[PDB]
Every structure is written in C-alpha cells, then in structure tokens.
Structure 1
C-alpha cells in the first residue's frame, strides 16, 4: 500500500537538497524510491537515515544486472543498509533474478522486477523481450514488477501477464511523457521524478498530481 498511489523518485544528488524536496512533499508520500545518483554521491547510509528523518519506505532502484553470485552480494548490502525493496533487471536471465529472490526471502525483504524500460533506446532490445521477461517473472514467482507508463499499451499487457494479485509500479510519468491518469488504470502506483523535485515548488506539484487523480 502506497499513500496516494504516488512514489517519490528522489533523484537529486545533494544530500540536503534531497532531504529537502523530500520534506517539501512529505505530506503526499510515504514511499520513496532512491537510486544510484543519490546513494553513490552521499553513501548507503543516506538510506538508513531516510527511514527516520522521514519514517518512509525505501525502494532501492539499483537495477541489479550482474551474474547470480554478484547479484546476491549487491542485494545483501542493500538490505543490510536497510532498504525495503530493490529493483532488479530481468534481461540478465532467470538465474540472476533468482539470486536476488533468495536474498530477499532470506532477509524478509522485496524484489521488484523491471520488465520494460521507459526511454527510447528501450526499443532496440528490451521491448522485444518484455513479455518473456514478465513471464519469467511469473515462473520465478515474482510478485512485484515495474513497467513503463510511457507505453500505456505495454502497461496493460504487463498486467495481463503478471495477474491481478501482483504489485505493479510505473515510471516515465511527467518528464518522459506519461500521464498519471492513463497509467494508474493498470498499475498500483506511479513514480514521478523530475516533475516534482525540479519544480519552482515541489510541494505544489505533488499536490496537483494528486488532484489530477484524486478522483479514483
């Protein structure tokens, strides 16, 4: 359950700037997605902190895409650092995703499978494997997925593959071009990045987005 179905993609690289725009919209969010831009430039402890300076839940968007052995070490350190869930790439195959799954289960945490990406280059290879990846995701027993809001049609097919009792979230809303309304029809929640943390007033953006979909 994600408050207001919205997830903050705190992608600012300044620690303070981060805990700021994050505080300037704390009201409308309870789930934060944190990536490498912030973590590498400020350290993994920027996570265990968030889980207090804001009490929110943290999804580590690390797109794990290595061999099984290394994926296991990466997931361990991300969870030890105290992350609630970690986003994993599916293109490396089923043994690599399985490695992340074991660790999540061993530590009682969550794995999110990224099936398709939102950006343009995604057409070359990712798109043609998307469905097969989502399906691998089902054979593997994955219950959490990430899909592109930049492609409403794919987003609907994804929901068809994963089922109704699978959790789904969607990036690409706003800057990349996705609409917060169309997207929420198949996915359990959206993820908005730049469209918030870069507006003259981030507080008055994560307010309007909630308005454009406070109906549902």
Structure 2
C-alpha cells in the first residue's frame, strides 16, 4: 500500500534509491522533476530495471487537444497511468480517458490537492470534481493525506470500489495509518528519498501500518 514518489532529479540518485526500496513498494510515481531532467526514456528504464508499475505524475491541466497529445506521449513512453487534474473540466478529463482507452492504460483523477494553497480554490470544487469523475467512469483518484476529513468525503463520493491513492504523507504532515483508513495506498516521496537510509525509512512506514 506504498507508492514511491521519485522526485530526485538525477538518474543515478533516482535509480539508487528506487533499487534500495524496491521490496517495500510495487509502484513508482515519476513526475516532471525527474522526466524534465533525464528525459522520458527514464520511464521505460525504471519499468524494465525494477519491474514496477509507473504512474506519471504530470498533473495534466490543459485543453482537450493538448491533454490528448500529452497522454499519448506519456503512454508511448511506457507509463501505466497518468495523473490528470479535474479542475479544468470534463472535456479535458475525457480527452485523457479517451487516450487511456485507446492505449489500454489508466487515468488517475486529482481531486483535492494536499498543500495549503489547495484550500483557496480547489477544495471548494473538489466534491464536484469527484462527482464529475464518477459520472465520467473514472475509477482511480488522488486525494489529500493532509486532510483526512476531506479524504473521507472523497471516498464517500467515489465509493469503495474505486482506487484512491494519497500524497502528503510524511514531509507535508500526513500520517500513514490515518490516511489508509480511507485511501487504498499512500504516496511517499521525501520521507523516503531524502532519508539517510531510504530502505529503513520505507520499512519503518510499512511497520507503522
């Protein structure tokens, strides 16, 4: 129930840490910090070297036509799933869902974000964003570890059969156990990759739950 957020920017460090904690995870979330520094080929390299599923954390948030292009390039690169913002609206989300269907991949809908600024505009639209996801047939969602009461409400909207993952554990203040009361899996980045012993940090999280 642990997903590693691999946001280190250099290939050597990213490969080292991911290899050290492989036994504690099954999925690696790779985003722009690593991809823009080392190239999209890093996705296929990780998939091959570690045999883990890869979620591309690209917070897709453009118009439908551009979202389609981003999703196509991302799935061509080997990602198993992509994270898409719901705030830009249904047409933008549908464009991503259409490419995922064409390529046999998945879309994760980012509802409410975990950082403080999410309270300004996203939080007020999050319940409706989750409902839009349900209406569009979305089965995978992202919600905040930092606000378990919001994570509970989002779980209420999407149902027990939807898959919900949650970032904000550790560095941002979220608790593994409390988050897993509602999410199926937790995303952890810095608490593991900036640790003196990433494997010990991962093991500690797994033990705490």
RMSD, matched Cα: 0.4
> Secondary structure of the equivalent of 1:158?
helix
Q: Partners of 2:61 and 2:97 in 1: how far apart?
A: 13
Q: Partners of 1:16 and 1:157 in 2: how far apart?
A: 40
Following superposition, the deviation at residue 145 of structure 1 comes to 0.2
- 1:106-137 per-position Cα deviation (integer Å, ceiling 9, x unaligned): 00000000000000111110000000000001
Following superposition, the deviation at residue 55 of structure 1 comes to 0.8
Q: Partners of 2:75 and 2:181 in 1: how far apart?
A: 31
Q: Partners of 2:72 and 2:48 in 1: how far apart?
A: 21
Following superposition, the deviation at residue 147 of structure 1 comes to 0.2
- 1:139-174 per-position Cα deviation (integer Å, ceiling 9, x unaligned): 111000000000000000000000111000000000
Match of 2:116 among 91, 108, 120: 120
> Secondary structure of the equivalent of 1:32?
strand
Q: Partners of 2:89 and 2:74 in 1: how far apart?
A: 21
1:90 aligned partner:
86
2:64 aligned partner:
68
Q: Partners of 1:59 and 1:86 in 2: how far apart?
A: 6
Q: What's the TM-score, normalizing by structure 1?
A: 0.96
Q: Partners of 1:57 and 1:138 in 2: how far apart?
A: 24
- 1:56-102 per-position Cα deviation (integer Å, ceiling 9, x unaligned): 11000001000000000000000000100000000000000000000
- 1:173-207 per-position Cα deviation (integer Å, ceiling 9, x unaligned): 00000000000011100001100000111011000
Following superposition, the deviation at residue 30 of structure 1 comes to 1.3
Q: Tell me the number of residue pairs that the alignment of Structure 1 and Structure 2 aligns.
A: 209
> Secondary structure of the equivalent of 2:201?
coil
Residue ranges of structure 1 left out of the alignment (5+ in a row): none
- 1:30-62 per-position Cα deviation (integer Å, ceiling 9, x unaligned): 100000000000000000111111111100000
Match of 2:166 among 167, 170, 191: 170
Q: Partners of 2:25 and 2:167 in 1: how far apart?
A: 16
1:190 aligned partner:
186
Following superposition, the deviation at residue 27 of structure 1 comes to 1.1
Following superposition, the deviation at residue 208 of structure 1 comes to 0.2
> Secondary structure of the equivalent of 1:34?
strand
Runs of 4+ with deviation above 2 angstroms: none
> Secondary structure of the equivalent of 1:164?
coil
| Deviates most, 78-87 or 48-57 | 48-57
> Secondary structure of the equivalent of 2:160?
coil
Q: Partners of 1:138 and 1:89 in 2: how far apart?
A: 14
